[PDB]
Amino acid sequence: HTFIVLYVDFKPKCFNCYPAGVNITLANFNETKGPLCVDTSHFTTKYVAVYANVGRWSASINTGNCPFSFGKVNNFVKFGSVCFSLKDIPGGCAMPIVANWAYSKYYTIGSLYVSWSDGDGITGVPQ
Amino acid sequence: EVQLVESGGGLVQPGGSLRLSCAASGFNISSSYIHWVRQAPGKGLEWVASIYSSYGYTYYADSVKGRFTISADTSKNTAYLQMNSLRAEDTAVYYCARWWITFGGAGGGLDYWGQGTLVTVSSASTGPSVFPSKSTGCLVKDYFPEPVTVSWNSGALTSGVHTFPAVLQSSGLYSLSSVVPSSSLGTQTYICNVNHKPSNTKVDK
Amino acid sequence: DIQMTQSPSSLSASVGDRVTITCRSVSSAVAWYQQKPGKAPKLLIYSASSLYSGVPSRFSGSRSGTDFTLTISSLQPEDFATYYCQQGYAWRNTFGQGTKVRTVAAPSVFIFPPSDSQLKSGTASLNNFYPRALQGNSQESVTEQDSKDSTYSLSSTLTLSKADYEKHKVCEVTSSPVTKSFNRG
Ligand SMILES: *[C@@H]1O[C@H](CO)[C@@H](O)[C@H](O)[C@H]1NC(C)=O
Ligand SMILES: *[C@@H]1O[C@H](CO)[C@@H](O)[C@H](O)[C@H]1NC(C)=O
């Protein structure tokens, strides 16, 4: 199949607040070429925590604009095709990548945008 | 009301520069994608560049990437293609087109088409001549380049009329013709209307 | 970055026949258009799933594995067009080779003399037929297939000048070769 890896990375009065971590990257995502599209019949959604998961900190990928949290795509779901991008995909949806200094304070860093095609032509893979 | 209007073509020297304007009505261009597609004479569809005008996304093709440039004016509701450093691989008829999105991000496809306009990369010069009981027809000669409009009585009625493509004269000029009522020759004054655009040749004869 | 392959690029069948146009790393994002020669195309099928509202139901497109296919149930005379399969998304457009898509009729041959206004410079100089001093110097031109007629048309371009003013006062079809080449008077 094809791996779809989403790397999240950041380096932390509130010292760890506002971590200037920008290495949010996608697998061979030539943005000018366009969103990274699924051309194989199978693909594996993968979330990578490059950011130092200090006990004080954590992260999330929960998306309100999308029907499915990242990692329910791995489950067999009705897609015909699907492209992933970190630039806004018109007529699609978006995933906020919040970051918690602690449970007390949150803030988003990046947004994961995903294309979408009709029906159930291609299914995901949770291998 | 819904229309895509290509304009701003014609004849260009080698390595010259042109600008195609794709006006639109009946829809706002920013809410959709606008693509260009070029068809070479006697060839198939060749993929050119596209733009999402609202966000400003400019995607290109593998052949025309460092030569063509896409843009748009959403206040004017008009897309544009600036073409520089042209060669005879690019001479073709270009069409601007509207791509609409599915309820997801793939898009449905390219919805809407225009009639397009043809550009000719040539260094040759560009003035045709029109000259007309056999059983039970205007002739265009010495023109360059295409196209040439042929009609009868200003698009009054042409039923069963066949039009012939340009006859390639080996010297580099063109020629063609077009043409039935058997028992009604002197009923009205049948006259043809032929227009050669780049030579500005339009007289009813 | 994937490429698309389309074949055959010339498929000339008869009425009622099922044209099976096919193209082929892919997914559910392809489209099918038709096009008359020198005319604007039209969106027939998209995402190999459904039609465009108003498109005839004889066109149907679907895929198996890596193979996308358009099929016409009962071909009609107006279905004459060059069909193109497109692949990609709202940003990427890619096409293929293109696929070009029958009762014999009678050809009536006309050919007319030069005009007086043509002779001043020094120069001088076939209807709805299904089937496909001699020189091909005098040129000939062909039209595309007609809509209901499904017929064609040819031209007899006499590539002549006033250098042959009175050289020859005196048509070529393949039973009886029609000889309506008239003389001057
Ligand atoms: C981001 O991480 C990738 C993983 O290998 C690395 O190649 C790249 O240099 C990193 N970019 C940074 C730290 O700016
Ligand atoms: C995109 O592809 C081009 C191919 O020439 C390459 O030069 C460029 O570095 C690539 N950029 C990214 C961000 O992958």
Numbering used by the authors:
A (entry chain D): 299 to 310, 316 to 430
B (entry chain H): 1 to 126, 128 to 133, 138 to 141, 149 to 191, 194 to 219
C (entry chain L): 1 to 24, 28 to 104, 108 to 131, 136 to 142, 153 to 155, 157 to 191, 194 to 197, 202 to 212
What's written in the study?
To depict the currently elusive antigenic signatures of α-HCoVs S proteins, we isolated a panel of antibodies against the HCoV-229E S protein and characterized their epitopes and neutralizing potential. The S protein is composed of two subunits, S1 and S2. The S1 subunit contains the N-terminal domain (NTD) and C-terminal domain (CTD), both could be engaged in host receptor recognition and viral attachment. In the receptor binding domain, a neutralizing epitope is captured in the end distal to the receptor binding site, reminiscent of the locations of the SARS-CoV-2 RBD cryptic epitopes.
Given that C04 was selected from a naïve synthetic library, it obviously lacks the opportunity to improve its affinity through somatic hypermutation. To enhance the neutralizing potency of C04, we thus performed in vitro affinity maturation using a soft-randomized library based on the parental clone and obtained a subset of positive clones which exhibit higher affinities for both 229E RBD and S trimer. Of these affinity-matured antibodies, antibody S11 and S15 exhibited up to an 11-fold increase in their affinities for 229E RBD and S trimer, largely due to their much slower disassociation from targets. Accordingly, IgG S11 and S15 manifested significantly enhanced neutralizing activity against 229E PsV infections as compared to IgG C04, with IC50 values at 19 and 40 μg/mL respectively. We also went further to characterize the structure of S11-RBD complex and found that the binding mode of S11 is the same to that of C04, with an overall RMSD of 0.69 Å. The major difference between S11 and C04 lies in their unique G-rich CDRH3 loops, wherein CDRH3 residues A109S110V111 matured into I109T110F111 in S11, thereby enabling additional sidechain-to-sidechain hydrophobic packing with P393 and W419 of RBD. Hence, analogous to the ‘cryptic’ epitopes in the distal end of SARS-CoV-2 RBD, a neutralizing epitope is also located in the distal end of 229E RBD.
